[PDB]
Amino acid sequence: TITSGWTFGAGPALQIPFPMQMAYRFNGIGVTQNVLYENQKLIANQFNS
Amino acid sequence: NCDVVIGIVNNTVYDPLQPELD
Numbered sequence: 001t002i003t004s005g006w007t008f009g010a011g012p013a014l015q016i017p018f019p020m021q022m023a024y025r026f027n028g029i030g031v032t033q034n035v036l037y038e039n040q041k042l043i044a045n046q047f048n049s
Numbered sequence: 050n051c052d053v054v055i056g057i058v059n060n061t062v063y064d065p066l067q068p069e070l071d
């Protein structure tokens with residue numbers, strides 16, 4: 001999951017950078033993907049706590 | 050602006066209107 005998201009459950013594992021994985025996941029819930037890319041540090045630090 | 054995202058690359062973005070229009 002951390003390296004290929006959900007692709008390995010449907011076929012071959014396809015690598016993608018994790019920061020880009022998180023951005024697709026926000027898109028799936030109707031949030032525009034720049035919200036992560038411009039705030040990557042904030043989301044990662046808040047998640048870690 | 051392209052100074053907050055980490056990992057941006059420099060490339061040309063093609064606008065189809067500009068050449069034909071001008």
Ligand SMILES: *[C@@H]1O[C@H](CO)[C@@H](O[C@@H]2O[C@H](CO)[C@@H](O)[C@H](O)[C@H]2NC(C)=O)[C@H](O)[C@H]1NC(C)=O
Nearest residue numbers: 050051052053054055056057058059060061062
């Ligand atoms: C992407 O393009 C911008 C704009 O040309 C580059 O910004 C310049 O970077 C040089 C150093 O490489 C500085 O001397 C200039 O002052 C910068 N220009 C501005 C307007 O800030 C940027 O470096 C390029 N990115 C890469 C990775 O080459």
